[PDB]
Amino acid sequence: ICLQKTTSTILKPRLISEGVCITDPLLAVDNGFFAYSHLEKIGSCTRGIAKQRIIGVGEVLDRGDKVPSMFMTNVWTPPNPSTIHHCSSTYHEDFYYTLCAVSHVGDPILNSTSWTESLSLIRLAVRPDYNQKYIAITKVERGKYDKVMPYGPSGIKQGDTLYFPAVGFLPRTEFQYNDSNCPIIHCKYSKAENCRLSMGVNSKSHYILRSGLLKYNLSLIILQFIEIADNRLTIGSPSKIYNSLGQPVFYQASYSWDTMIKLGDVDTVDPLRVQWRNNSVISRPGQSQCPRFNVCPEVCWEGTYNDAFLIDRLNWVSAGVYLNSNQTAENPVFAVFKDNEILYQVPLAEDDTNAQKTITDCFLLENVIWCISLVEIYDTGDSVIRPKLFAVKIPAQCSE
Amino acid sequence: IVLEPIYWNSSNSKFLPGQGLVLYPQIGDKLDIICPKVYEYYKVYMVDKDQADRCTIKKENTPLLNCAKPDQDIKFTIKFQEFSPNLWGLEFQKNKDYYIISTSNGSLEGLDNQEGGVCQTRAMKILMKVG
């Protein structure tokens, strides 16, 4: 397995399968099985009329060429695709369970104050009402947070307990932050209230968004919010906890001024401590206020989700797809790297190919390290726009 | 194509007095709007038409450029397509018009003036004729 920096073209991505946009993608990958969702929109990826929500599961199967492939088993459509949002899926004992939220009032992140804090989980058999079940979550323990909600693609299991990524909405009228801790010392222009203002969408926002886990014990059913440690605190963001090589590693989207990559090994699950890497190479596209490689505190909420995956803890090597663009959703390139160094990469498209919300969930196939990614990829000219799937073997030797 | 960077500045001879700066991007282009470093103070917002034609930005409105750094080039890049780091569902589409202005008076004192400004007295307003 390549451990040397090298520009050799060792990484060899293989693409593995009208006026509509598929967006809001989910992919999860557990031990052999996968979860997935999207939303089908009529027209614009943002506004277009929502055609049909899907949520499906199935198996990740190699055939003869020892490339893995998608084999959807079970697929589920809610009855109105307008009102389900921010789903997330943790597999368990021959199920994927997937926690969506429900809404009467649109995407809660953006009309939070009017959001009934309503939830619902769907369990889908991977090897198919054993096949398909619904639950309207009735009891939810969240502590001080007015209301909680999933916030990321996938979680993990612990004996009889699931953990989803989720987010807490505390009104700052109650939010406790010391401004002296806002690190501006090498930041000529950056003020102290920055960090605190930047915990919300508007600096004035009713709530702030704190990241964490939603706890779900099958040995009981009640969901229970666990907030993330205040450490390298950034506004709530879609994030994912995932088991790797024996322990789980967390990732938070860098959705405001801290635009370096937020990932790391979880030291405790509840309360949630993450030994965030001091990584200096990966980042994301922002906009004007908090663009690529911004470290300085700013009043912003902007960015995209691009997780990576720990592929070797011993030398903390991760991998994943990154958008190589300062302020624009372009140029998805698969990146294999370390805290202070990208070993080898690979561009998945042209220089000017549009991409957006990337994901990666890795595994062994037939004794060798593979990474599926997702992506949301498209080209100017293209007719229907949808997420694409990429396998990627990880090279054994650092030769071509 | 990467079109000609547009400097948001009182001097810019492209902001014509009756119809502001009109530009015809095509889907797939990318455009920089840039407030240079010294200083004129501006918050610039993508608006709708009525807001353009009335020079008004309403509380909801979140800016695309916060030009309040005397000694720093503050720059914003639009690529015209459906995918943006923008988390408010603002994208770009053929045969549609999109209006970028500010109601700022330019001083640091009138920065957040939500009405009037250099949109309505200079014609500081980009009209992007997409497609």
| Experimental technique used to determine this entry | X-ray
Closest Cα partner for A304 from A288, A327, A320, A275? Answer: A327
Q: Do B66 and A110 touch (CB under 8 A)?
A: no
Shortest alpha-carbon distance between residue B89 and chain A (Å):
4
Q: For residue A208, give the CATH number of its domain.
A: 2.120.10.10
Q: Phi first, then psi: what are they for A398, rounded to 5°?
A: -90, 50
- For residue A332, cis peptide bond before it (omega within 30 degrees of 0): no
**Residue from the list A21, A45, A302 with its beta carbon closest to the beta carbon of B85:** A302
Residue A129 burial (CB < 10 Å; 0-12/13-18/19+)? exposed
Q: Are B69 and B40 in contact (CB under 8 A)?
A: no
Resolution in A: 3.3
Number of structural domains chain A divides into: 1
Contacts of residue A185, Cβ cutoff 8 Å, sequence gap at least 6: none
How many whole angstroms separate alpha carbon A142 and alpha carbon A214?
9
Interface test with A, best of B41, B72, B81, B100 (most A CBs within 10 A): B81
How many whole angstroms separate alpha carbon A328 and alpha carbon B32?
11
How many whole angstroms separate alpha carbon A270 and alpha carbon B29?
47
Q: Are A21 and B84 in contact (CB under 8 A)?
A: no
How many whole angstroms separate alpha carbon A234 and alpha carbon A228?
10
Q: Do A352 and B75 touch (CB under 8 A)?
A: no
Q: Are A374 and A332 in contact (CB under 8 A)?
A: no
What would the two tokens of residue B127 be?
């009209």
Query: Which residues are registered as beta bridge partners of A377?
Result: A355
How many whole angstroms separate alpha carbon A280 and alpha carbon A97?
35
Query: Which residues are registered as beta bridge partners of A158?
Result: A161
Q: Are A103 and A87 in contact (CB under 8 A)?
A: no
Discontinuities after residues in chain B (C–N over 2.5 A): 38
Other CB atoms closer than 10 Å to residue B7's CB: what's the count?
15
How many whole angstroms separate alpha carbon B104 and alpha carbon B117?
5
**Residue from the list B28, B72, B83 with its beta carbon closest to the beta carbon of A376:** B83
Which amino acid appears at position A31 of this protein?
A: N
Which amino acid appears at position A362 of this protein?
A: C
The dihedral of CA A299, A301, A302, A308: what is its sign?
A: positive
What would the two tokens of residue A214 be?
């939603």
Q: Are A124 and A55 in contact (CB under 8 A)?
A: yes
Interface test with A, best of B7, B64, B82 (most A CBs within 10 A): B82
Closest Cα partner for A369 from A6, A10, A9? Answer: A10
End-to-end CA distance of chain A: 12
Q: Tell me the HSE value of A348 on the side-chain side, using a 13 A CA sphere.
A: 34
Q: Phi first, then psi: what are they for B28, rounded to 5°?
A: 100, -10
Which positions in chain A touch B82 (Cβ < 8 Å)? 21, 44-46, 354, 378, 385
Mark A131-157 as b/e (b = at least 16 C-beta within 10 Å): eeeeeebeebebeebbbbbbbbbbbbb
Q: Are A165 and A150 in contact (CB under 8 A)?
A: yes
Which amino acid appears at position A123 of this protein?
A: R
> Which domain covers residue A261, as residue numbers?
1-400
For the domain B1-131, what is the CATH code?
Answer: 2.60.40.420
Mind spelling out the 3-state secondary structure of chain B?
A: CECCCEECCCCCCCCECCCEEEECCCCCCEEEEEECCCCCEEEEEEECHHHHHHCECCCCCCCCEEECCCCCCEEEEEECCCCCCCCCCCCCCCCCEEEEECCCCECCCCCCCCECCCCCCCCCEEEEECC
Closest Cα partner for B103 from B56, B63, B40? Answer: B56
Region for residue B49 given its phi and psi (left: phi exceeds 0; alpha: psi -120 to 50; beta: otherwise): alpha
